[PDB]
């Protein structure tokens, strides 16, 4: 169920020269490369220990591909300002996400590409990877142009072949980290918020991959504050689910943790 | 590995 994904951001800064451009690569929930045009000679650099082995060949090629994307996205930002009839003075964001997934068998499962203009779905590569599709009516000219150029074909070949090829290569390099399931170290903390109510916070700490389900239940029979999954900064993730309960009735509530790295779902109950 | 080609909108 592994994936190779890149997240590209182009931000126009009119008057202050070339748009800001950043690429980041992930294998599953592990960043392994990045490019930032904010530098003298901006290059693709390793962002995972297991990626330092690669040669000048890789870094020169990835640098070239990253610089080419930045140049094209600088053009795209002009084109999109034009399409939406926007001022040349304003900053605008273009985002491009692409990824290939492997199945249980370790073969190509699926590929996807989307780009967003100013945080909104703009243009989507269809399920079949045969054509690009306008989301709103403003992306219609991009769909016509992309199909006329058969953009989908070049992206399909990437997602089906070279994306899958290199995912397998990355999974091999640093299999120590990438293929290891780190289960969540789970506990429940109690936080009296008022005279009549307390917060029960169910913790999942130092887990990998990022996928995890935290649910609160009540014995006999729940509304949950679910905080955004966050990096610990060591490649593992933290999450907590909170439920407001009547003070004194905390032990009626169970937290349920589901994680790949757990053989079965874990149930916790607060003990005084 | 990045794709060689970025879509021209």
């Amino acid at each position, epitope marked *: 169920s592994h994936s190779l994904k890149y997240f590209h951001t182009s931000v126009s800064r009119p008057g202050r020269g070339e748009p800001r451009f950043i690429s980041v690569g992930y294998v599953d929930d592990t960043q392994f490369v990045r490019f930032d045009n904010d530098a003298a000679s901006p290059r693709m650099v390793p962002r995972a220990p297991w990626m330092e082995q690669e040669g000048s060949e890789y870094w020169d090629r990835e640098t070239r591909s990253a610089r080419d994307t930045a140049q*094209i996205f*600088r*053009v795209n930002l002009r084109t999109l300002r034009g399409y939406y009839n926007q001022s040349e003075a304003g900053s605008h964001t273009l985002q491009w996400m692409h990824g290939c997934e492997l199945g249980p068998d370790g073969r190509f499962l699926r590929g996807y590409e989307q780009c967003a203009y100013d945080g909104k779905d703009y243009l989507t590569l269809n399920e079949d990877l045969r054509s690009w599709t306008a989301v709103d009516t403003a992306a219609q000219i991009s769909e016509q*142009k992309s199909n006329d*150029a*058969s953009e989908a074909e070049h992206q399909r070949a990437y997602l089906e072949d070279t994306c899958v090829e290199w995912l397998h290569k990355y999974l091999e390099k640093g299999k120590e980290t990438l293929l290891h399931l780190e289960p969540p170290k789970t506990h429940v903390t109690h936080h009296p918020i008022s005279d009549h109510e307390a917060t029960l916070r169910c913790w999942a700490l130092g887990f990998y991959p990022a996928e995890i389900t935290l649910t609160w239940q009540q014995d006999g029979e729940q509304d949950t504050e679910l905080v955004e999954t966050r990096p610990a900064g060591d490649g593992t993730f933290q999450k907590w689910a909170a439920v407001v309960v009547p003070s004194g009735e905390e032990q009626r509530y169970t937290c349920h943790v589901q994680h790949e790295g757990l053989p079965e779902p874990v149930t916790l109950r607060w003990k005084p | 590995r990045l794709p060689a*080609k970025a879509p*021209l909108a």
Partner: T-cell receptor, first 112, second 115 residues
């Protein structure tokens, strides 16, 4: 990078004979292949443009085919005339799809 | 007018600087500079995908370009060298990727650099 080979480099044929100018490219991920004519001391003029989606383009006695999989184009010149005598240059899109990469050209001499 | 190039011919002493002029009035976003040498065909020096946007080609060393306007793509030899003796061709197209892929060439500039 994208690399273009034109086979052969020089061709001398009696007028009236059919002949093939060949173009092979290492990276088959191209948008367009284009054939150009170049007379001595002149610029290039576009003969035929073939989109990656198309399989051939015809212009009179010129027929250009595109085979992405094998990664080559054949420019077929039917019933060759001395007026066909020129340098024939093949270009495909670079990997970025931002400019054209050219081969070393085929110099054709259709002997009168 | 298509693609304009001046001058048609030029002699330079080694170390001299020189601007090869190129203009098109077809409003093309895509412009490029090539050098043609015997049996070597055309080798990409620099290319532009729009105004204020230029990048290095196959053989960029010894040359600078600027794309101030859509019309103009001047090629600058900073310090002329004998190896830069070539015919320099400027090209433009409406599109590199689309059906409107026809590339238009200038008449070319014969440059000779002597000691």
């Amino acid at each position: 990078a994208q690399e273009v080979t034109q086979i052969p480099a020089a061709l001398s044929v009696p007028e009236g004979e059919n002949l093939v100018l060949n173009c092979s490219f290492t990276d088959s991920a191209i948008y367009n292949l284009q054939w150009f004519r170049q007379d001595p001391g002149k610029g290039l003029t576009s003969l035929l443009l073939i989109q990656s989606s198309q399989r051939e383009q015809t212009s009179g006695r010129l027929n250009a085919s595109l085979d992405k999989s094998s990664g080559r184009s054949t420019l077929y010149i039917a019933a060759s005339q001395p007026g066909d005598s020129a340098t024939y240059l093949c270009a495909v899109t670079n990997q970025a799809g931002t400019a054209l990469i050219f081969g070393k050209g085929t110099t054709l001499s259709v002997s009168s | 007018a298509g693609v304009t190039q001046t001058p048609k011919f030029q002699v330079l002493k080694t170390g001299q600087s020189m601007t090869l002029q190129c203009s098109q009035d077809m409003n093309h976003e895509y412009m490029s500079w090539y050098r043609q040498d015997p049996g070597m065909g055309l080798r990409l020096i620099h290319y532009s995908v729009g105004a204020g946007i230029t990048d290095q080609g196959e053989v960029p060393n010894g040359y600078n370009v600027s794309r101030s306007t859509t019309e103009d793509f001047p090629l600058r030899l900073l310090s002329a060298a004998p190896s830069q003796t070539s015919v320099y061709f400027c090209a433009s197209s409406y599109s590199i990727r689309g059906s409107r892929g026809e590339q238009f060439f200038g008449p070319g500039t014969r440059l000779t650099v002597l000691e």
